[PDB]
Amino acid sequence: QLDSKLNDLKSLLKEIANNIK
Amino acid sequence: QLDSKLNDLKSLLKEIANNIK
Secondary structure (H helix, E strand, C coil): CHHHHHHHHHHHCCCHHHHHC | CHHHHHHHHHHHCCCHHHHHC
């Protein structure tokens, strides 16, 4: 569960890059 | 495998910075 939570934290902020551009 | 997956998530988004600039 903790590993999945860290994965979720990493993934949720991946979109923002394309939102920036 | 889970640690490597988290590492891959961290690494895949490292390039974008230079793509931003």
